[PDB]
């Protein structure tokens, strides 16, 4: 109950409480936490434990040794920030599942006119900036063979070996947004400028183009993922969601402290 | 008491305690309630009220409309303000106490020796360099005030004649001014003086000279201000004394999450 | 030795002088810097470069122009000496943010981190008069960028319809000018701050206009470098921080003040 | 020459000190305070017996006391350097009087003469509230004893055991220029009103004015010394004497750093 002590006097942990209620930062705790059990009610059953811990060790694996210090300088642990990675992951799959149901023949139709089918390209990723600019003025030289400056100075080690070469359409995770958009941008044998996705520059030569069907049928379940994709990064949709599902809790706001930092939503 | 209610379950105060304890600007919150507990244990008797409701007043003034809003942005209220700025006084009121008390014969020795007493001058401020050369072969051959109401940019000194007073502790004219002046004989005229947001020039006439006198209590009080100003902007002379009043008061800080936050201190 | 002063049938030598002026409290602070060049100059002269000190008394040479040689007898110098103090105060400064450096802690990173608020970009509109900053408010409630370029006496921002950006940690804007910003949403007009009237400067009015606001990251090494020049020019600026620095470097030296007459100027450090 | 610092594989030297500090304006006056004092110990030093500087001595010691040793510190001096400073003082004031008193004319007897108003019987009662004067003032005015009132009232120890008595002239410091002024328009047995020295409050009563003479052979010595003690407090005099006694001593300036300074003078 006793968080400090000193001669003569305490602070208490309800005395905290009655000073931090008004902080923002502290406002923004209790949201976060309202929005994490609501969401943990509604569809924690449904998330799997791997989904999260999965993420949590793929994170781990990015930041390394750094990761103790930059978690303690942003004030959360490794739990904390479990809890805060389960959150996102359960807004998610919200937005996935209130999405999958409402899939109309309408909404497949407007992702289909703007669908692309499979086309393979020679991809080269580089950390350094002077690096990809230096690769990109060897790549539009005169006899200049794409395959062997992917091979001698790309660093993704999956594409690397086949002379940056890699096939994917408008629905493939295993290449970044602003890559896809600006190979489907270009013509046969036309190099890109430098795509830029502590980040990664691309360069993207394409190579080969696939037509697409008249008939919608065969392209459903990566049409959904387009769609779904989409609304997972439609911030309007993300907000509704939350706020509905909120809504269906039935949340009340017990100290008036907290009554404005819920408006949003309630 | 609970905070938060939902379908079939709550979010209590302890809860949320449990999760607002690791975050920074909450850390923060309770540093400063106890260090305001412990500076009006000590110092709270001798700090007038009054000085306090002048700081606020100050602050009302130079906010104005915004005061509400930026009060509203901290997480804050006229009340809990003018409680923060009582703690400032009782922490800068401790302050001046321990730099007086280390006040020796040699800080008062070299700020004695350090200090020019008043003299009186006539300025002209010029934003241009080439005007100022041209208001300086006007000035060095003249009706020097009648230059300054014409030509002079600082509306402080520009209607009476670029007329001043000042000693080398004043703050209203730049160093290479003063230092310039008091270099000077009696109406004697400087070349341009360049100060350095925007950088200003300046031609000095000197009217008057003050004869320092042998004995150090003459200027007792004014070296005094000189010595104790400097150590009551020193962080780190501050940031000592609220570490030494916190080890008197003996604090035993009880959850591990805050023992960062006051290593510093104790 | 040599004679200083000659009159009929007597002479002041410069031993003589000595034993007098050694007790001047001018005199001893002279002997006190003669003693810190020394230590810092055998600690950290290599390091630096005589193009900047060059810069500096060049700089300053500019700012005085023939005031400078009047300037410098006043201050106790000629050109060459100071020269060497120009070149000593760079030395102490350069060991204090090596010290500075070595002593950043995770919870002063962690402080600042905290109290750091990230680049916004914004318009504002100085003012002289009060009345005139009423009147340009309610017209401001609007093309801000035309408000400003006609009645800003703020000449740097007018040019470019009174935009700027800045941190928390600008000195460039006043502090109520910037915690008024940071208090706005976007598009979010401010009504009159004020920077009340003091000695040195007249009392000015602003009003500003937020245009963008970076969002706040979670991960402390986006900023690490603007944190950690803050926290080391705060202790650059430090007067009690910088004694106690010339007070180590001149213990490491171990210093023997021979002439008693000196000793007490020596104790602050020693 | 000897060693005044030493460190690690380094020494600073007395000669290495002596070329700095000769810059240093503070270190300038000092010498020239030393050729002063040894042009004036020469020529006029054997007249003054160091008894006459111990009592001077004798009378500041007694007066600060035990802080003695501090006060000297403080000022930038010692015992023997302020002992020093006080026999030149006396031999500069010697000299000083010797040609004022060669320069004697019969103009300057008249002027003085016009200008003095001969001896003057009055007691006074000094106060240090204003308050507590004017309630006194009330009360002598009324049948009092003038005599009694500044006894059991007046703060000055030396006056209070006499009735308050004190005789002077226009000549006398030992009673202020705003005391006197206000004594000598004052009737026989006429009480003043509340006089404001500056801040120490008077009330003077008139006892015993002289009614002045004609011929001014009467007050012939008394008019001397006034004309002298005024040519000892006129700078400009005493300075012109200090300086035309410098050019008697034929004073080479054998480094051109101290140049300057002796050219004030010389
Ligand atoms: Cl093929
Ligand atoms: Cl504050
Ligand atoms: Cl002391
Ligand atoms: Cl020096
Ligand atoms: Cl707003
Ligand atoms: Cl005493």
Request: glycine share 4%; proline share 1%; charged share 30%.
């Amino acid at each position: 109950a006793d968080l400090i002590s000193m001669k003569g006097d305490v602070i208490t942990e309800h005395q905290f409480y009655e000073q931090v209620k008004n902080n923002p930062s502290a406002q923004q705790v209790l949201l976060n936490m309202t929005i994490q059990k609501v969401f943990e009610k509604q569809y924690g059953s449904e998330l799997d434990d791997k989904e999260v811990d999965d993420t949590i060790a793929e994170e781990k694996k990015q930041y390394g040794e750094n990761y103790q210090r930059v978690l303690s300088q942003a004030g959360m642990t490794l739990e904390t920030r479990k809890a805060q990675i389960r959150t996102s992951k359960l807004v998610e799959l919200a937005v996935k599942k209130v999405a999958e149901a409402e899939l109309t023949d309408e909404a497949y139709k407007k992702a289909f006119d703007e669908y692309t089918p499979d086309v393979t390209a020679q991809i080269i990723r580089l950390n350094n900036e002077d690096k990809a600019k230096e690769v990109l003025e060897k790549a539009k030289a005169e006899g200049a063979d794409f395959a062997q400056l992917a091979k001698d100075n790309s660093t993704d080690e999956k594409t690397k070996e086949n002379g940056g070469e890699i096939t994917f359409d408008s629905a493939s995770t295993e290449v970044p947004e602003q890559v896809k958009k600006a190979a489907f941008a270009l013509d046969v044998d036309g190099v890109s400028d430098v795509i830029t996705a502590s980040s990664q520059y691309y360069i993207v030569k394409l190579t080969k183009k696939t037509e697409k069907s008249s008939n919608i049928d065969d392209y459903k379940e990566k049409l959904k993922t387009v769609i779904l994709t989409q609304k997972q990064n439609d911030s309007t949709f993300v907000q509704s969601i939350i706020g509905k599902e909120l809504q269906a809790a039935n949340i009340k706001v017990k100290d008036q402290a907290f009554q404005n930092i819920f408006t949003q939503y309630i």
